[PDB]
Design a protein around this ligand. Structure first.
Ligand SMILES: CCC(=O)CCC(C)(C)O
Length: 156
């Protein structure tokens, strides 16, 4: 297990397929049925100073491809991407082969909100990992009512 902000982090290892398992935010509407941030990650392609992120959005079961590139910032293990405002994110924890936890801060017109996600190499993860994710969300001030499990709706 490693953190993108640590020194033993090997970016190249998060390359490949991933799935959105759980999404959480202190701004629930952002990840609800019609939210701009209810994104289902499909793949991460690691570049020297960037990350190519491929997702799909869903509207009444219809899926649409979406891609974007996040660039490294001045801070180690942190990336930024423009999407409905300015976003910076880090990877507080991942084991490379099974799960990945992300933490993002969005700033738009003086307004801010944070989003945290749990991603898996498989379309679902154990309840222990999910609970461990819920505990990290708590530490960031995000309550369970604002945590949404999408493991049963992440496929097209
Ligand atoms: C605009 C980019 C996102 O919402 C999701 C970022 C990750 C996959 C890092 O959590």
């Amino acid at each position: 297990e490693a953190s993108s902000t640590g020194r033993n982090f090997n970016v190249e290892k998060i390359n490949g397929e991933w799935h959105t398992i759980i999404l959480a935010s202190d701004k629930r509407e952002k990840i609800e049925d019609n939210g701009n941030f209810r994104l289902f990650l499909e793949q991460i392609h690691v570049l020297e100073n960037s990350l190519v992120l491929k997702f799909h959005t869903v509207r009444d079961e219809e899926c649409s491809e979406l891609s974007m590139v996040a660039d490294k910032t001045e801070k180690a293990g942190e990336y930024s991407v423009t999407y409905d405002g300015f976003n910076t994110f880090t990877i507080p924890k991942t084991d490379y082969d099974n799960f990945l936890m992300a933490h993002l801060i969005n700033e738009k017109d003086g307004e801010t909100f944070q989003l945290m996600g749990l991603y898996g190499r498989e379309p679902d993860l154990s309840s222990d990992i999910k609970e461990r994710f819920a505990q990290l969300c708590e530490e960031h001030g995000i309550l369970r009512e604002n945590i949404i499990d999408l493991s049963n709706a992440n496929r097209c």
